[PDB]
């Protein structure tokens, strides 16, 4: 079993991207299957648009500096761009392409592929970003630490006009994770303590929600919004996933992975639109069918976990199935 | 009489820097005199610190891109730095040195002279900034127009920590002039129409005062605060200089230059601390001495004009004397 | 005594430019003196125009690629230009500026300083050119070897119209030195063996004179014409300088340096206009005064040697005096 | 009927290339037929080697900047090279490939396809070139106008050693057309007046022949040598084609197109080796067969015209047939 | 090493055709080399004309019923013709193309490719044929067994006029092999016993020569004439090749394959025009050079064997070299 | 009186088959009578076996392509078979059934009626064959002209083994009529000019006899042998029937029809075994009885003519009686 270095959902959560030390893979979620694969070499960043057969490939070191965009349906190379330093993150929408280095931000137009704007930012060794995926509210946010309490400063940058809009005084400590909703309305961040989750409304700048996560300080791996902006997902080193309800404190519902899973695994999750499931097959503990929110949690060990959450009851979520990436 | 391309006061307003097409000169204000001069070449930017024998010299194009730092007392060269494009503005405090190109901002430590930060901004063909001269509140502000209504966006940048603090939605149109008080507390901005003057409190961001300037729209050359932040001075193409009182609308007092003066003159001004003047010599229209704020207005034609303002009466200001720079 | 890396006369031969590992110096010839000097850094190319306080300064590697134009009277910088590779030669007239890299030629207008033309040539590791200093016949010639017998092909390029005029099949072997007279009428070339010196008439292209140099093949350092195109001076590794008379084969007159001189010295020379010298002081072997052509030969060890040639007698030339540059 | 933008014979004159706004076509001459076609898009330059299934494709704007080499028999792409500006001409021999922009010349080796030499020339908005098609005498000539009487300067460049050989003082006015014989021995040029045709011997530089063309000044569209260097063909805006005999003034023989043809049409021609025709079928006005020089003249309207010339009589040439390109 | 299903010389013996289960190959004989190849699939019949880049391809099952004619130089398909049953043999000359099924004969004109004549013959499971390759004497002969001693009846069919010419009472038993000389003058046949070889003159019908082959009855694989009609070659299951002289019984000269070769291999041979060889290199056991008849024997295992025969001495033939088909 | 399209004897010559445009009829020869008749439709081919109540019926176009086998005694249908084109000839023996189209020959087993063989021949628009009626020597012969001098090539085909035996180069011109004796021993052929009659021995292939017919070339309608192969009968457009004696040139005996007969009549004949006739009734010009070979000649106009030939005298033959078929 080859080691994997990167997992990432698309901007809608209906697909899967992945990068191994021997190649990369592209899966699908509802009619599960291996859509694409290529065993060329180690890949560290595999980012794709809303399907559309568009990919962004960063080699593990094709070095980590070079970024290559490949159209999988045409099997051709759109362009290749090099960078002075290793790439730390690449994110995309159907309007702009952004490449982030440790102290610089590069912004490209996805169509023309010509360089547009460059931001000189204070060092970000963690490669933290968040991009609104919609063109109507195209906003990019990056942290602004002081150069050596005013450490958790985040710069709200509008990609449409290529000018900053405001400065958000997010937290006292360094930012550890950040995400933007699908429509670009909201924003969520968390310090390196992972104890307090804060939600700011990007257009006005007001803090809307403040959630407490866990009891003691522990690392946060990633944050992701629901597609309908109803729920927010956080994953940490405690091998537990929390879901906070944004329909408005304590986490609304929690996901516990199977015990056999090792605790030293990074997990990214995604929340999908509610679906109907047959209660006859699953003794939830009854109407024949009731709406269940499906949750997909994939870990760096190469597994996929499917949960269902009751929007009213919440609580601990039942687990339906456990596929295995890199195999059937 | 050689043509002059650049005039500015020092950060305290007690000195004069000037650049001709043949060299640069340095003057003084109260015991007027010519401290230094060199007939080296064309100079476009001659900026000085709080005396201290430190200068920034930019050639007319010594190219326009090159910047040279010279100690006038030692007649030596501290350093020499080049830039890919022509320099548009240079400002200093006793802690940081800022060089602005049309699209880039370079910040240097005044002591070590090593580069500290670089800012990629939207193009500024007008070379507009404002630098707080005090190290306690060292702030830099530069405009951020959208790249091709929200055209008059300005970025409040902190030099101490090298991180921006906030974004101020100053005006609807493009910014034309910026000025920061001596202590770095306030910032004043002017749109390209020069009809509304707005001053913001830099730490909070709230607009404190709003001034109406003149009757019709006309260009603004420069803005400058008083040492004690009591008054604000603006000069425009109407050949008239206005003084706005910040002790708290309409201009408090107006400076009318002599009629024979050319109308197409760049005019910069400065406000000094109140001093005692004898009313026996000057029929102000009476106690023997009364405090009157002295104002120095140097124009691009090469003349200095001294005025006095009565802080209570205000109104049209009397002119005492006129020298002639370059002579 | 710092090492020196570059010596050349001006386009009239009445001045000296020189570059050390610590700075550059500028001298004069008839009333000998040191006009200028700076201990800035290593300089590899120091080229001057017809006095006029204009210089081209190239750092030893200020990198070798960078070229800086400095006005010594104003102590300012006209401009600063970089190149992808190290500069190999720089020459000027009062109309054009030429910068040569190993495979590229850049031509600049001396006044506006904007780029005018670029020539892609076959590699020239020796950095060889020749520039006519008069604007009436402004010509540039550079060698064009085949890219890997016809190896000594040289391209006659007109700077005025920026179009080549003709191709001269100069020599069978690679070109080693090129020189153009003051008026731009003639061009002289030297093969890598230094045995045959050929001069061509640039407008017609016909070889006018052919000179045999020395007895055996040896390297040639530089060639230079007289102001009136009467004589041609070549210097080689044999520590001997030859003068060929163009008033029309064998060298007309030979310059033998003092024996104590090191043999491994780069030697450049120049020929000046005839002057009156007193035979009473100098027993030439007699009228009190007779015109004798003065020759100045500066070597890489740092010394200047003054000779005189009798235009009718020719022959071995007497040496009058010796100074010491850098002292 | 789609509009066509480019017509060009091969280096031997036994084939035809063509480019439309919808695709390109490749014909043949003696056993006439449509050898190849591809309706991809607009093409502006279609240049091919001596058969050998080698092509050079320049899109109308595959932009005009990009040049693509396609092997029609293998249906694959050998390589793709981009250029900063739009391409104005591409010519080839079995040794070198040259791409010309408005102020630059690029020279490539046809086999290795690596860049060899670059010439910085004065602006040529007309895209004028001439290449000897034989490797024994590989010479390339381009005009050298002054940069703003010495306007008609042409630089004779040897492609083998990549060094200029001489400078030719061709004409007083700007050069309008130029061509090189098959063996690379001769050269022919004409100013923008089109009144005087001059022939220079490329190896020595001497002007060998000087022909007068027409009476009043009129534009010249193209010049082409005969394969055996016996005759030279010029075509102008007068809807008339002249042939000058090089076996050595006034044009030896002239070709008049049918009256129905519009005068605002560009025509390129080619001269083939002499062939035997039966005088019984054609009342020339008699031996049964006598040698006739065949001439093929194709116009931008999409037609082909076949003429026969008597090398001794010359004069106005009889027209045998009139095919139609884009159809049968 | 892929298995091969078909080997056949051309009508002159100067080339080689071959068909594998993965593709087909085309070799050459005197300047030995691999002229062509194509790894598409299994091929059972690969027949080619006198060079001329013409091929006949029958798939192993492109089924065995379908026959496809491909021009290897043009890489195109001339035509495709289907048949109700599997093809058993295809032979060609520069005038006619004949396709044989188990009970039917189809004759086509090679140029026009339209059907001309069809012969309804009694069943021939062995696919036996013989065609004169010259247009002057275009004769086709096929066996005519009785439908269930008069079993070895062969019908002499003239392809030019498409009418039978005579009936030959060849042998008492079933015919096993048959061949026609290059000029179409002679004919040779052999029964399934392989003991007696009979030669009939096709124009008159008289039996000219009768040769005894071997001692006991054994199978005969193929018969081939010399180009000059001087010698006749037979190959059997005894791993031995006999040559009978037609300059006029017992075989004149015999060819013994190397012992390492397996006996269960089918061998086809061909006789070429006499050539000069240097006796200095080869100690034949002496003039420096003497004429030797070269013989090429290829077996179904994938090897080629070159022999030399002395026309006067005959006897056992020396073997010069042993190439290897499917490799160098 | 309906038109008649087809007349032929049986394989023994003791019966008559006939086809009208309204139906078919079957007669007898020695005790003359009408055995059978049906007014069904137009019939073009009515062929019978050796009595045995077996018939082959082809419609006039029951299309011309269709063939129907009918048993007249049972009034039933044995089978029905169609063909892609119109049938041109049908013949039988007691072992095989042959159907000929213009370019194809079909052979059927008379008993099982399953198809046995098919022959692809060059086109025969005249529908010519010859069938041996004995199973001991069952042979079929059909012409093989070249497909567009050797035009009269005929193929000897053996029905028993279904394989051809030999090819006979019969005549230079196209074959016009073929006939095989009762035992299948001999075959007779006639060219389109009808001048030369050739008979070949089918087993050996050698031409045995050659007969000259008439004086000038004229068409031949049919040929038929005697039962004992003693005589051969040919009928042509000259309204004269010739008898050639094969007991071994010029015709042995000639049959002249009555003058009133139409000249444009298809005439077929047959030769029977010798019988005893009374010379008292017939003045032959005498023993009371002498054997005379009876000849029956039925013509397309619908009449039967009875002749007698003296085997020794030969010569012109006397006519005894005339009936009228269809009445």
Residue numbers in the entry:
A (entry chain F), D (entry chain D), E (entry chain B): 5 to 65, 70 to 156, 222 to 321, 409 to 445, 458 to 500
B (entry chain E), C (entry chain C), F (entry chain A): 5 to 65, 70 to 156, 222 to 321, 409 to 445, 458 to 499
The study reports:
Atg18 belongs to the protein family of β-propellers that bind polyphosphoinositides (PROPPIN). The autophagic membrane adapter Atg18 reveals an unexpected structural plasticity in multiple modes of oligomeric organization.
To further investigate the binding mode of Atg18 to lipid membranes, we mixed soluble Atg18 with PI3,5P2-doped large unilamellar vesicles (LUVs). When membranes are aligned in parallel, we found connecting density that we interpreted as Atg18 bridging two juxtaposed bilayers. In the density, we found Atg18 molecules in four pairs of dimers with a slightly twisted interface matching the observed I-interface of the tubular Atg18 assembly determined above. Notably in the cryo-EM density, the basic Atg18 dimer unit was found to assume a 45° tilt angle with respect to both membrane planes, which could be independently confirmed by measurements in raw tomogram slices. The rigid body fit of the Atg18 dimer was consistent with the location of the PI3P binding sites as well as the 6CD loop facing opposing membrane bilayers.
